[PDB]
Structures are given as C-alpha cells and as structure tokens.
Amino acid sequence: ASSRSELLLDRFAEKIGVGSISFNENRLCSFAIDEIYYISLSDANDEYMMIYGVCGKFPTDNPNFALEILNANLWFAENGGPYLCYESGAQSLLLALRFPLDDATPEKLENEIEVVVKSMENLYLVLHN
C-alpha cells in the first residue's frame, strides 16, 4: 500500500535488471554505480525525490577551491545539472538533483540518475585544475 516513490524504485530496478532494492531506516536507497560513483536516492518529500551523488570527503588543505566549486556551479546552472553542495555530517561533497514525482516514470528516474553520474564523472573536467 506504498506511495509512488516505492513503486518507481521497484519498476526502475525492473527496467535495468538488477533485481530488487528498497528504502532504508533513513528514507533513502544508496547504490554505487561502478563502485566509484556513489548515488543515494532519497524520497525527501511527498512531491519529490532528491538524487544525491556523493563525491567523497571535501579537501581542507589550502581549500581555496571551495570558491572554485562555487564557481563551477555556474556551469551546472546553465546546463541544468545538479547543484554542487557541501554537506557537514560527512564533510563530503555532493551533487544534488531534485526529481519530482508527478508524471514520473522508470525511464525518467534512470535518465536523471545517470545525469548525476555524468556530473560526477565530468566534474574534474568542469574545473580549472
């Protein structure tokens, strides 16, 4: 008797053929695509899921580049990509994509998940050094 988030998941895992997945005690579903690109699907809200791409711990040794990331965010804003965000509980960088649930489809979830992957992939290219 599940809300639409929990269907999309099941329907999505059916679409890519990886079996079955679920949401955890903390209302999210973390899977790592190719053991490098970490992604956690959250259903933050009745209206939307968030899509988190985790990019590791965040450097703090001459971290003048926090302003470089903030500068990178210009690119993702023009391109429609995820928001570059910093998170304090794991000191980890994050790509954030909101994903709304009306007119949501397994192919649309699949599409946006890999958007976070190509963002996490291309990130070092979008930066100056």
């Binding site: 890519i16 790592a32 970490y38 509980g89 980890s92 397994p106």
Partner: peptide
C-alpha cells in the same frame, strides 16, 4: 555486482549496493 541490460540511459556495467566516499544515511535539516 549487478549487471544492467537495459535500453535506458545506464549504458554502464554494474551496480554495487552500499549497506573514499561516505554514502551517508542522513544530512542535517536543522
């Protein structure tokens, strides 16, 4: 290690599920 055989935009080899990247289970609302 799950292999994807989908038409969708995941033309990529495998998915690993996590029970140097944190894979956090929560971020601070407040």
């Amino acid at each position: 290690g799950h292999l994807i055989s989908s038409t969708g935009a995941l033309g990529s080899r495998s998915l690993f599920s996590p029970l140097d990247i944190p894979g956090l289970p929560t971020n601070p609302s407040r």
